[PDB]
Design a protein around this ligand. Sequence first.
Ligand SMILES: Nc1nc2c(ncn2[C@@H]2O[C@H](COP(=O)(O)OP(=O)(O)O)[C@@H](O)[C@H]2O)c(=O)[nH]1
Length: 190
Amino acid sequence: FINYSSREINCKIVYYGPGLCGKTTNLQYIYNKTAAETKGKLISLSTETDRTLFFDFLPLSLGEIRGFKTRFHLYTVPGQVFYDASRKLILKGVDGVVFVADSQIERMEANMESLENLRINLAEQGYDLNKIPYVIQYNKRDLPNAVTVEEMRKALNHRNIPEYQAVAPTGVGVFDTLKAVAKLVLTELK
Ligand SMILES: Nc1nc2c(ncn2[C@@H]2O[C@H](COP(=O)(O)OP(=O)(O)O)[C@@H](O)[C@H]2O)c(=O)[nH]1
């Protein structure tokens, strides 16, 4: 999304996953551990029905595509967002998507049905997941109730697609996940 006069194209990175998985902790480790003269301000919106969390920033690797740099955005939905007309609204012209799956055995049947939603909301909006940048981040690895990744690749990453093992409050692969989707969108931009 080029802005002509402002001479700075904008991309769309979204974090998808079940209710309480690691989308909010992901953006915090990023914004809460960066520098002001690059990023904007962390916006948190909320109503009695739905919630939205998002921020904007300038990368630290690029400069000129047509003589201009990109300015990625990270959009998400904290908590158990009931209504599906807000999660359809969060994918309004998405460029790259990250799937924060919860390694928790308790909510392992929760990742499947949440992935099914991403696989049914995008094709509805004219987006095929196999071409539109999509990465998966296996979070909550520290918890001793968590399943082996060998099983998560079999059940959630059926038609792989790059994967990343991460732990959100320690920062493990929070930024390492983002750097993968970034280049995947940057390549699909010329
Ligand atoms: N131990 C641990 N806790 C995590 C991890 N990721 C998220 N959490 C916790 O899980 C809870 C819900 O996650 P949060 O990101 O805040 O909300 P979400 O936006 O609905 O996924 C919070 O208490 C987080 O601290 C992780 O990798 N390890």
